[PDB]
A paper describes a structure:
The rms distance is 0.62 Å for AgRai1, and small changes for helix αF (containing motif V) and other regions are visible, although these changes are unlikely to seriously affect RNA binding. The structures of the AgRai1 and CaRai1 free enzymes will not be described further here. AgRai1 has the strongest decapping and exonuclease activities in our assays. The αC helix is absent in AgRai1 but contains more than four turns in CaRai1 and SsRai1, which also have a longer αD helix.
The overall structures of CaRai1, AgRai1 and SsRai1 are similar to those of SpRai1 (16), KlDxo1 (18), and MmDXO.
Author numbering: 5 to 10, 14 to 296, 303 to 371
The structure:
Amino acid sequence: SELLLQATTALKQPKELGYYSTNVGGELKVMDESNLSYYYLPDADIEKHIDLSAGARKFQDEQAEAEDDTGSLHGLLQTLMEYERRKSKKVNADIIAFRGQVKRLIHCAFGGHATDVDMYVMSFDGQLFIRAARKKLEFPTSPRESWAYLAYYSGYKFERMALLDRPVAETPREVLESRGKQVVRNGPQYKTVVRTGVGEHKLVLGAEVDGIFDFREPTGDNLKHYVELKVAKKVQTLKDATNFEQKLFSVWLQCFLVGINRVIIGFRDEKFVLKSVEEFSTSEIPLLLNACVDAIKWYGALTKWLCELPRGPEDDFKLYRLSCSRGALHLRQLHDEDLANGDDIIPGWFREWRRSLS
């Protein structure tokens, strides 16, 4: 099947189903907020001219050095199982995926690289499970003082300088006075798991969350308290403005998909010094920027298209490659027994869980 990249539709309010904390090296803690950080970046720290390139040489990159399947649904599925177990009921949804993959599908109609839409779709138990085909991320391999390396590292340094492991009230003075000494890491992650929808279809999406902005509600839905952080170059030219608009569009997509309302941008100069930080509401972004309106209509279209795939009992473990080329998304059914029978897309333990649940 194909769907051409060129229909009015409404969004459902996303609801948080659960969350989990992970790291490379096999750490997975389901329904556990250990790795959830808290925003804290006083103006007095910013006024001292934070160098976002500081520490690039001494950085120990956990993600880059791990051999791990970055597309795996295993953490998401373990969290979903725990949610379903507590409820005694299969989640009501059509598609289960990571937010980043759905973002890629949306973005490929609006400037994204067609070449790297590469996903597996598997039907199981009335639902579609979608994962990135590739198992390894691309990390910059240029020297650490290269622009490409600093662009990558600066994101993590900004997070370490703007975030705390716990609320400010629970943080010792020693840490608050010496933010630049704290070790920069990209291993620990915290993800939310959200039920969302567009048009008449529903999705469960996993999504990385950078932190809590204001406070957390221990017994509530925290989507409204989450914040995503991004580093952008301060705008001083046409070229900078265009790059920033594209970054704004991208972070808007990331937040809107899972009901996050808060974005913080760290503006850097050409020397990677943080110049200022600005809060944006997710809703502010389309106003500032019809790409956003059309992206939601495209989201609706592509989701309705995927949901045409057969999802009855006889379709269990059928597998399709999802791609983008010649101005269209494409679905091609595969016949790969090991890949379909192995644990790479839907692991045996989750199959067993859903069977028992039936």
